[PDB]
Amino acid sequence: KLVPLAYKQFSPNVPEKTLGASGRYEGKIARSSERFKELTPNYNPDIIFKDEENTGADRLMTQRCKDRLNSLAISVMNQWPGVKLRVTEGWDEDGHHSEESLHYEGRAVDITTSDRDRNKYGLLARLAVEAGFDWVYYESKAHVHCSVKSE
Ligand SMILES: [Zn+2]
């Protein structure tokens, strides 16, 4: 039933920031922006946040992103007992991506399984699609990129 995504594959099969997918970039959200109130914390106890920058900024995302992320968290545990959803990257303030990255406004996450078993990433990407993320992309061997439309 669930066919894993192939490496470098994305779904839907169109560029990310286009209509049928995640839609267009709506501008960066810096801490000091009024847009900041669009972000909302995700405190899901069953999602691992890498939190590499130590700020917990990884947890701040749109309500839409949060909701897709949470459901994925539940199907991940369903697909593999012992394994959870993991986020390596979410809201980015340091421009570590392209121009107009959805990461810049809390509409994108980079995910893995909690066990970091790259063997799982293809199937994970698929679950993310099932979870209703609006664009899912097996970006690299080490993580999967998921994004959503704006509200
Ligand atoms: Zn990403």
From Swiss-Prot:
Summary of subunit composition and partner proteins: Multimer.
Binding sites annotated in the UniProt record for Ca(2+) 1: E52, E53, D58, T88, E89
Residues of the full protein shown: 43 to 193 of 411
Superkingdom assignment: Eukaryota
Sites where the protein binds Ca(2+) 2: E53, E89, D92, D94
Result, substituting E89K: In BDA1; no effect on the stability of the indian hedgehog protein N-product
Residues involved in Zn(2+) binding: H103, D110, H145
Subcellular location(s) per record: Cell membrane
PTM comment text: Cholesterylation is required for N-product targeting to lipid rafts and multimerization.
Name used for this protein in its record: Indian hedgehog protein N-product
Effect listed in the UniProt record for changing E53K: In BDA1; decreases the stability of the indian hedgehog protein N-product
Role, per record: The dually lipidated indian hedgehog protein N-product is a morphogen which is essential for a variety of patterning events during development. Binds to the patched (PTCH1) receptor, which functions in association with smoothened (SMO), to activate the transcription of target genes. Plays a role in morphogenesis of the skeleton by coordinating growth and differentiation of the endochondral skeleton. Positively regulates PTHLH expression during endochondral bone formation preventing chondrocyte hypertrophy.
Comment field on protein domains: Binds calcium and zinc ions; this stabilizes the protein fold and is essential for protein-protein interactions mediated by this domain.
Disulfide links within the chain: none
Organism for this UniProt entry: Homo sapiens
Topology in the lipid bilayer: Lipid-anchor
Phenotypic consequence of D58N: In BDA1; decreases the stability of the indian hedgehog protein N-product
